Write a protein that binds this ligand. Structure first.
Ligand code: A1D84
Length: 278
């Protein structure tokens, strides 16, 4: 026998068309699986339609049952972090989460391709689009920081194309609160230099978003270490990466890539620039 699905929430499961008497899972009974959006060691993401309301969503499920109470605690923690983010037009919105059969499910709004996928199936993007992605993801960071939260893995793969040129930031598994809480290793290509010393704060996201946007704007791989990695963290843009970048975009990126986090521009300061108006 199998225990009924349980809602996972850190704030305070039954749905139309779900029958506990029937053997198959809440996920099998309550959704129509339409396509697979992604698969990895983190599990799988599916595009689904909900039987409850008839609308499209995405559902991420973990790959293997919990191995022990700590493994379970650490996986469920993602839901608590995501709930702290809440509703914001530039953040992937969690609808509900649940556990069944030792598997964790997160149901969110359905978003488009990641910025990474969008780039791969474009070369270098029109700068007008890049400005939109930068602005939207800056709004997301201002929102996170207002909640005392820092995303420690801002990267092209974690930003999803919404409606009409809009970007939403997601994957809040590596969110920390301003103690910190347990966290995994962010992608070294986009890592703020102060994180080498374990120092973090709202500035670390801004730096990562700077290299995220640099990468999508120039369509070149960033170094994961060695001299190239250091030379992106000196306070200038290496010419290697700047071919075809406008003077306007270059200047905003260099504000975001300031190595001293005390000097680095805040999301709100960047959003107040005339170039990022509206
Ligand atoms: C379901 C879910 C729950 C919580 C959450 O925060 C997010 C973002 C999602 C979510 C994830 C994905 C997706 C697709 C392919 N690869 C990845 N990953 C690659 C590695 C990892 N970092 C990110 C993620 C797509 C969508 C979407 N298109 O609607 C989506 N809403």
């Amino acid at each position: 026998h199998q225990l009924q699905p349980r809602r996972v929430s850190f704030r305070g499961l039954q749905s139309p068309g779900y029958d506990p008497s029937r053997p198959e899972s809440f996920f099998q009974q309550s959704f129509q699986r339409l396509s697979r959006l992604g698969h990895g060691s983190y599990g799988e993401v599916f595009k689904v339609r909900s039987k409850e309301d008839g609308r499209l969503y995405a559902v991420k499920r973990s790959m293997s049952p919990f191995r022990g109470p700590k493994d379970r605690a650490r996986k469920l923690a993602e839901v608590g972090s995501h709930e702290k983010v809440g509703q914001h037009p530039c953040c992937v919105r969690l609808e509900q989460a649940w556990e069944e059969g030792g598997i964790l499910y997160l149901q969110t709004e359905l978003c488009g391709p990641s910025l990474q996928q969008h780039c791969e199936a474009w070369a270098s993007l029109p700068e007008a689009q890049v400005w939109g992605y930068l602005r939207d993801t800056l709004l997301a960071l201002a929102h996170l920081h207002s909640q005392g939260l820092v995303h420690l893995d801002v990267k092209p793969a974690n930003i999803f194309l919404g409606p009409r040129g809009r970007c939403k930031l997601g994957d809040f598994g590596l969110l920390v609160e301003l103690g910190a809480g347990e966290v995994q290793e962010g992608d070294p290509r986009y890592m703020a230099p102060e994180l080498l010393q374990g120092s973090y704060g709202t500035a670390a996201d801004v730096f990562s978003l700077g290299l995220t946007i640099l990468e999508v704007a120039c369509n070149m791989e960033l170094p994961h270490g060695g001299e190239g990695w250091q030379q992106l963290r000196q306070g200038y843009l290496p010419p290697e990466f700047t071919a075809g970048l406008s003077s306007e975009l270059r200047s905003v990126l260099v504000m975001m890539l300031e190595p001293d986090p005390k000097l680095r521009a805040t999301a709100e300061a960047l959003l107040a620039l005339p170039v990022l108006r509206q």
